[PDB]
Amino acid sequence: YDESTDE
Amino acid sequence: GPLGSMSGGFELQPRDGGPRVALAPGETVIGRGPLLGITDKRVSRRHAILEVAGGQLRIKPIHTNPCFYQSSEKSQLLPLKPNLWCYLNPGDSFSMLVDKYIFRILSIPS
Ligand SMILES: [Mg+2]
């Protein structure tokens, strides 16, 4: 859960 | 006279048959992370807040990627208004994507 959120 | 206190707790039941998750009293931030086991990168690690208090459950979407709601009486998950608390009734569902990570609200003892 270290990756940035996809928008 | 005064009404005093109200009790009642809540559990989340994944639509896909995964294990149920009991909610703690007070606020719990939900989203991508170990609590619900959500890993899809489209869900924020700070996606929504749930609050259990006084026998009621409310949700607040806190990210631009929205949350969805389906009343127990209806049949379509629809977007919740961003950044506003909304009470959820037992038997209602909410989701973190329109068609994935869907949870039904169950009532349990405090
Ligand atoms: Mg960000």
Author numbering:
A (entry chain D): 229 to 235
B (entry chain A): -4 to 105
Text taken from the publication that reported this structure:
Aprataxin, aprataxin and PNKP-like factor (APLF) and polynucleotide kinase phosphatase (PNKP) are key DNA-repair proteins with diverse functions but which all contain a homologous forkhead-associated (FHA) domain. Their primary binding targets are casein kinase 2-phosphorylated forms of the XRCC1 and XRCC4 scaffold molecules which respectively coordinate single-stranded and double-stranded DNA break repair pathways. The precise role of APLF is yet to be determined although it does possess both endo- and exo-nuclease activity and its depletion is associated with impairment of NHEJ.
Here, we present the high-resolution X-ray structure of a complex of phosphorylated XRCC4 with APLF, the most divergent of the three FHA domain family members. The final model contains two complexes each comprising residues 1–104 of APLF with an additional five N-terminal-residues derived from the cleaved GST-tag and the bound tri-phosphorylated XRCC4 phosphopeptide. Comparison of the APLF FHA domain structure with those of PNKP and aprataxin shows that, as expected from the relatively high degree of sequence homology, their FHA domain β-sandwich folds are similar overall, although, consistent with sequence comparison, the APLF structure is most divergent and contains a six-residue extension in loop β6–β7. The XRCC4 phosphopeptide adopts an orientation similar to that observed in previously reported FHA/phosphopeptide structures, lying across the tips of loops β3–β4 and β5–β6. A second set of hydrogen bonds constrains the peptide backbone on either side; the Arg27 side-chain interacts with the pT −2 and the Asn60 side-chain hydrogen-bonds with the pT +1 carbonyl. Tyr229 in position pT −4 is held in place by a hydrophobic stacking interaction with Pro29. In accordance with the lack of binding effect associated with phosphorylation of Ser237, only residues pT −4 to pT +2 could be modelled into the electron density, indicating that the C-terminal end of the peptide, including Asp236 at pT +3, and pSer237 at the pT +4 position, is mobile. Side-chain density for APLF Lys36, equivalent to PNKP Arg44 is very poor suggesting that it is highly mobile. However, it appears to be in a suitable position for electrostatic recognition of both Glu pT −2, Asp pT +1 and pSer at pT −1 (see below).
